[PDB]
């Protein structure tokens, strides 16, 4: 049997990456979070107060609370089946803004724009994304060379 300890096996997880042991860069606690914002937890060794727990390391969740230097945040945690939407309290040093959201809200700001315009025209524009289509028959042109002849090369034991 193994030990239930809160920081078991994190020997390699919470470890500051490389050539970064030291002062936390001050930007990381001067960006703002407000309820609704989506956040990806990523623990960190230097700050021990308010750490998450290793099963949330790498997970995302939205924000529901904001205290003086921590953020209440709801993530999903799968347990033997049933997924429990549970809310944890994590100090800011272990948190980033997830740009996972931000591809859309840029497809949105552009979709809303491309619909307000081209509405004075009435021309229906492709608003939906659409997966990578078949590559659309074209030409190839060799100019004045035949292709280069390739031959499988004779084996020889290198060692």
């Amino acid at each position: 049997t193994n030990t239930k300890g809160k920081r078991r096996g994190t020997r390699y997880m919470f470890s500051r990456p490389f050539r970064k042991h030291g002062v936390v860069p001050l930007a990381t606690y001067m960006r703002i979070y407000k309820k609704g914002d989506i956040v990806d937890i990523k623990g960190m060794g230097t700050v021990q107060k308010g750490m998450p727990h290793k099963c949330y390391h790498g997970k995302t969740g939205r924000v529901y609370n904001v205290t003086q230097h921590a953020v209440g945040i709801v993530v999903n945690k799968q347990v033997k089946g049933k997924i429990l939407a549970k809310r944890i309290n994590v100090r800011i040093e272990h948190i980033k803004h997830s740009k996972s959201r931000d591809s859309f809200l840029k497809r949105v700001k552009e979709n809303d724009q491309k619909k307000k315009e081209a509405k004075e025209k009435g021309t229906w524009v492709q608003l939906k994304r659409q997966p990578a289509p078949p590559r659309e028959a074209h030409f190839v042109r060799t100019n004045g060379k035949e292709p280069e002849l390739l031959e499988p090369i004779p084996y020889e034991f290198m060692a």
């Binding site: 529901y64 609370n65 209440g72 033997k80 089946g81 049933k82």
Partner: protein
């Protein structure tokens, strides 16, 4: 009388037979867990919305008649 000591063998089958359910989320989730100084204030904000309903109602008819004028000036 030795026995098997553990396994997660067909467990994936079992808890996926009723199809692991992402927790059904409604709008308007509970405020339980938010810091008291927020609520202890936002309840006073909510409790006295009505004191100041006269401003809200007349100022609503102002924009309602200014945009009944904006949609009629278009006509």
């Amino acid at each position: 009388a030795k026995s098997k000591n553990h396994t997660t063998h067909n467990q994936s089958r079992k808890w996926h037979r009723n199809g692991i359910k992402k927790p059904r989320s409604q709008r308007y989730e509970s405020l339980k867990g938010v810091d008291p100084k927020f609520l202890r204030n936002m309840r006073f904000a909510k409790k006295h919305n009505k004191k100041g309903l006269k401003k809200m109602q007349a100022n609503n008819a102002k924009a309602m008649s200014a945009r009944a004028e904006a949609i009629k000036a278009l006509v």
